[model samples]
Target chain A: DERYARYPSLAGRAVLITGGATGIGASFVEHFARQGARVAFVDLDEQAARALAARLADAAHEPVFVACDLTDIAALRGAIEAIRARIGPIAALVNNAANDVRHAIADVTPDSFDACIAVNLRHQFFAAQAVIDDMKRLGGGSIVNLGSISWMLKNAGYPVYASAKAAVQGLTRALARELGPFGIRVNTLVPGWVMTQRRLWLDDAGRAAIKAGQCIDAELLPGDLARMALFLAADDSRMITAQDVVVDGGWA
Target chain B: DERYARYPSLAGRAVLITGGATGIGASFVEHFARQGARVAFVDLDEQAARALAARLADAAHEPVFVACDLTDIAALRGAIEAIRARIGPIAALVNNAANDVRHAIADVTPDSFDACIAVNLRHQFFAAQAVIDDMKRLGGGSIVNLGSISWMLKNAGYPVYASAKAAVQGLTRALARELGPFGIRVNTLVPGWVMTDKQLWLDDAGRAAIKAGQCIDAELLPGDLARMALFLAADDSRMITAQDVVVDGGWA
Candidate 1:
């Protein structure tokens, strides 16, 4: 039941994850910390972040928790700096912070749209921007931009959220080419409808439909994504960049 | 003018392409024909198919054109049979036929949805099913399903089309596992906004915005996809399967 891979290259590598308080980001924090990476994560949830850090205390290196509102660009940058000051230069970054709050297209205002972009998209760019020097200083690194299947599925009720999530692909590719010369790789990790607390609203019929749509008739989990992130962060996927590696149980 | 790869394994191989009369499919026809593959294609456009076949008469083996409406599964299957009878066992099947006819979500009807799925998705499954044995008999083969970035971009106006296109990845992975034991491969080829005949109507500002979004500052061409298709169909990408390879000049 436990045939997952152990990436030797991840050991002792400094890694940073954004929005690592809970959900998939927490899983990223845990997995990288388990790999012996000097993991530091920024989140707004102080209690959850502290609990997650405590949960990983037995790992090779306990994940450092820095509470920061990712929507605040200055705060996000400061958090990255704090991580650099604590753990050495960052060799991997997982831009996993996002909010998929549902909104009607007809009801969306300029402020709401901007807020969605700020939470889901803007921070990903600025965080990557903040960590580039650290990665470059380390001679090379990997940036894993978390994307969503909402946009790809063309589902209704969240136009703004979908728009911002879709932009992650653009960010990943643009950075991949620009950073390739430095041996840094950037790729998008798109997730389908994962059964997270965020999706507790999904009814039984809806869940059944999702399972039916997927090639593998099983529920996708945060661990499925964390595994792929580990591979991308490690040297195993060194040759891969400017690509969208979807971990949606084959759900398009 | 030509710096693309030359795939050695494609020469003399029997290849089948759907919707091969025009647009991206036309490029698939030309690329495989130029690669010395024994090519055959089906399309509803009789004149265009005949013209394309005549144009490729100088190839190692003249391209065969089968006229049929792919929405009719019986006709589509019969076309595959005709291609097999004429060319030999199919070594590659490129399910490239699709229509991006724009329609709003409110306008979608059950009939319209079914038709869109019929044209864009169903044939891909049946086409793969028909050729599974052929690929197994050849000891291996490749099935490249054409996907799109429209849904990924949350593009309005084509809800049904996007849904069907999205399902292609599901079909790809389910079959990849099922057919992997037989040495068969299945993958999705996602294209961004290529400058096809359908796209010539794009407004100047729209085109500018798309160009601005791409990492690489160049318009995507059908030839870009054709190059990737050649690699996937050849021995070079023998190890790659159940993946979505996006070729849009670095667009999401």
Candidate 2:
């Protein structure tokens, strides 16, 4: 735990995130806020966003709740700009807003496939585009794109989500080359099955199957992934970019 | 074991590669030809290429050789087309030609950086693009892009080479996403430090540093990387695309 304390401090830093109301997104929201960064997030569920915000609020560091459908990129940009104005400069971005589509390859129709991409990948790019100016102004910043080992391993039955998530690695590398001169680094945080409330209750059986596949033979928790994000998002990982760091219990 | 044998046989398949005179590329030419796949390769060193082609030659499978610099886009494409015309359709393409740039960040001039990119990255793209039509005509094919773990591990000295190798992953993913429906699967084969002929002569200080840095605590031979390339090239990996399979000892 002492290892976690040594970092380039985010004491005066501000972070902007998407889909931070629940699941993996919420974990990052709380983790970054607790790390002393000003956190602002957008989610469709206003109640969930506000409730989570209230829970994380303290005199020192709190989460700002913004309600918006991130798929509507225009509204997404407006919300990001508003956060920059109301809060301080956005220093780090977790492009963590994503959806998991679980459908057999045989069942994937064109409309269903497009929907999968729209929800999972479209926003990550536009959100990064929206934050580029602020990040550039600060001299440099970190962008962590949420990726998964599900697509990397055995057939997960959902090719569309896998296809889109695969693109995240590509985007990470491409952006790293284009943005490295401007002091921005883009990297993908690929985690194994993280034990979240949604996975525990909804996909418990499937989650157990995944944990059994890990070389470490333990269920991964959101905190584990959060620590990885922190490493990549801080100055300690300034040299790392365009790399997919798999935190998968050493699974292939 | 039957379950693990999902990979289809590569009987009668024709394959070609550049830089196949020696090192990992030579192993690739040897392995595919042994599996009853017709093999041809291009290399800047004509004597080395011819010697290799003769060693792997047989009545059933004779490896062909062409002498040309892969960095010349037009010359490379013409050479590839000649192979396709003479050897039947090219079913597999390995973009394994790369240059190791060992200069420090401060030492890398624009000319040196571009030269590294030209050999390691740009030629890979043009070579793949040249084979797209032939691959499509065959109703599908596989392209294995060679990447390096130095890019991921932030190897101290080779910053520019690492940058371009990282970009190869990006290019591989984009090609996979764009060409998936067409049956072409593009994936990156990223190998860790391999003690090929080049690395065999490394001085004691350099060898000791690499051995300590490796997670396996042992050197990887060229054959290890070639086997990985074969797995990616064969139909056994039909479902996999836009992936970077790390052939390192483990996480390092």
Candidate 3:
């Protein structure tokens, strides 16, 4: 872990993440906590979220977990208010909650379309909206919107998910423009298809595709995305904003 | 132009460009022509395209103009074939045609959405698809897909255009993976708020935004993007692919 960067800027800073219970989100929670930040994460999955938080109890400041379905804007708002009370004004917000469930294009109803947008795209905007005053008061902040390579790959079966992920780029830019003068930075972290233990979809074809696609000849793990997120959230990437920094190992 | 780079690898290459009559596209044509490449460009503005071709008639290889509407698939295919016949197998393709027409999100009809995608996003894919065989035969090639800062900056009044532009990122990545093993490379050239003669949008507010947003206190010009495109299309950038090379003075 010492081989990776340890940012002094992150020390004692309040960092917040959505869906930070498992997968790449879990990696984020772990990494930020390790960086001596007062980290808080929200997730509907209470058990895993709490368990993960307990595991990192010895970090500089223990991570706080609040249960909330990000699809409900009111619940999300309440959750963030509670988080701010405990963690202090959130210095960095990671809009990382997303569900990339595969669905046939024909099965995409209007209701489902709205639901997809709410989960993957809507919360990102609202989260940033809630944190504007906090960031401005602090004289600066960082916001990382977790984007996807799925859409970029033109991957099928999740058109709505891909579309919503694609929209994050616009959301990030819009926020950067609105908050930049106030010293707040916004960027999208596009992760390669990490070989997560959530292996419902990783088939022979997926494995073969990764082998062919990634120029690095290695599996992209969750920590790779986390490391970049740390740098973006730190003062080091102050000039970098409204950009999609890809960690796809030369793949999409 | 001597202050800029001269790519010997591009000297006798067959290069293709879309929307090469004026603005940033014209800069691309002029730059590629100046590099001694056999440049063939297509545009809906036949007169302007031909005039540009005539202006660069004394280059190492005279530029060729092909009149075509890129939104028409069959017509686009025919035009590319015509270009291939005239210029020899295309060694590089620049998907540079786009319309950033501003409109309210409420005004977006299904027909208009399709049209916006057609103009801003669709052709980049088909254009790249058409060139794969040529590039394969050439033993390698470069495809530079022109993207926007509008979407990245989250500029209002052009939601559809921004969405389409964002889609280009995915399109570039998708193409890169499928083509990388074949020795072809693909990338997105995201230009910032360029100071163009086509100034329908630059106002006092716009100028202020650029002044505050960009770190480098200078107007981003078409030539800045053109030079980056030249590098991406040449052997100098052989290792770079599936990336968005920004030419903004540091703004999204």
Per-residue lDDT of model 2, residues B1-252, tens digit only: 123222346767878787899889998898787777888888898888888878877735888887878767778978998898878887889888888857654344435644765787667766777788888899899989888886565554565566567666556765776678889998888988887787647789977777677767777878778778778888888889888888877744
Q: In candidate 1, how many Å is residue B140 off?
A: 19
Q: Mind giving the per-residue lDDT tens digits that candidate 3 earns over B79-142?
A: 9999999999998999999998877543545466557767876677668878988999988999
- Candidate 1, residues A1-252, lDDT tens digits: the string is 123455678888899999998889998998899878899999999999999999999989888978989999988888888888999888999999888888987889999999999999999899889888877788788999999888888888899988998899889878988886576889898887676643346788877776556654556778878877887797644545688877675556
Scored by lDDT, model 1 comes in at 0.83
| Residue B49 CA displacement from its true place in model 3, Å | 0.8
iRMSD, all candidates: 10.1, 9.8, 5.9
lDDT of 1 at B208: 80
Q: Give the per-residue lDDT digits (tens) of candidate 3, residues A1-252.
A: 778898999999999999999989999999999999999999989999989999999998999989989888779989999999999998999999999887764355546755776788767867887888899999999999999989777675666676678877876776677678889998999999787753346788767788788888787889999999999999898888889899989897
Clashing pairs in 3: A152-B170
What candidate 3 gets wrong by more than 4 Å, as runs, is A1-168, A171-252, B200-203
Residue A33 lDDT, candidate 2, scale 0-100: 82
The CAPRI classification for model 1 reads as incorrect
- What are the DockQ scores of the candidates, in order? 0.05, 0.04, 0.13
User: Candidate 1 or 3, higher TM-score?
Assistant: 3
lDDT of 2 by residue, A36-122 (tens): 778889998999998998888872577896799876767887899888887877878998888885675435444564466567766
Model 2 CA lDDT for position A188: 87
* lDDT scores in order: 0.83, 0.75, 0.84
Candidate 1 lDDT for residue A14: 90
With a 3 Å backbone cut-off (N, CA, C), the pairs that clash in candidate 1 are B103-B157
